Symmetry: C2
Subunit: 162 residues, 2 copies
């Protein structure tokens, strides 16, 4: 029921691309679970949905981001009228977790990408690569390069105060 | 002596930027040693020098690359007439060593960059960052991003079959 759901092996422990996904929601349907994966950033490419976390209910649309971190009790559901499509990057590693603690997003776990954000292009590009993933053509190197670019862009656009 | 020689800590074991350097050579002077560092790619930005490895003697110039790998007995010397300047990136890690085994450059340890090579810009950019390295502005993330771009560019331009 996903356009794309590429799951990668966990062979790197400093920086690792765990999975890349694309899902068109069905109206009024979503997911309600305790997050098991290390970290999963979602980018809303179309339509509307809601993200519920820690007593707060966010009405998200095209351009918005939400991030799932291990242990979060979450619910995210497509709108009954105009159901969202989202792209996601799951990632892990000691370096990945250190870089996430340098961004302001890991508190509220929701954000909006600005006009000239570099984040949408990186997430879309990582999902594009994932559709024809070929490690013998060194797609593994390119995905890690993009993951470093993505975490740099998150810190650049959503900095924690120094 | 070196206008730049930034040495970094070895804290990453999958991919690590070990050092970045810029050296204008002195005529007829060079180095003659067994390489201790994991991997060190040099890009010749001007003049001429020679790289001697395993009985072969290479006359290099602007645009050329040579790579030092741990254990290589090497000699590299600036030309008397027109001494080279080179930029270098030292790097290590299991991923780094796997990706190096995917490029044809680790056979001869020498290459020439094509007209529109992406390699010069990356090495120059990593040395530029190294001059004002500020980890609290996440320069550490940017240098590893550039190292992944560099190894990708080496494989793209100098592939094994
Ligand atoms: O991981 C992003 C992905 O999450 C799916 O939800 C899964 C989750 O991945 C898995 O760890 C958990 O055990 O089950 C969840 C399904 O209830 C979403 O289905 C998918 O749309 C993405 O959001
Ligand atoms: O590492 C590139 C750098 O090497 C210098 O030579 C050093 C080398 O780094 C060190 O490991 C070894 O013990 O001694 C060498 C000096 O003899 C070069 O001086 C420098 O120009 C770069 O090529």
């Amino acid at each position: 029921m996903q356009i794309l759901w590429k799951k990668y092996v966990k062979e790197n422990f400093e920086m690792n691309v765990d999975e890349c996904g694309i899902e068109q929601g069905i109206p009024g349907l979503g997911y309600n679970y305790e997050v098991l994966k290390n970290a999963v950033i979602h980018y809303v490419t179309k339509g509307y949905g809601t993200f519920k976390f820690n007593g707060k209910v966010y009405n998200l649309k095209q351009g918005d981001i939400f991030i799932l971190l291990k242990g979060m009790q979450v619910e995210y559901v497509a709108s009954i009228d105009d159901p969202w499509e989202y792209y996601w990057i799951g990632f892990s590693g000691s370096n990945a977790n250190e870089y996430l603690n340098r961004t302001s997003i890991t508190n509220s776990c929701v954000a909006n990408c600005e006009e000239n954000s570099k984040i949408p292009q990186i997430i879309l590009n990582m999902c594009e690569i994932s559709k024809t993933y070929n490690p013998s053509r060194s797609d593994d190197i390119l995905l890690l390069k993009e993951l470093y670019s993505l975490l740099y862009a998150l810190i650049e656009e959503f900095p924690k105060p120094f």
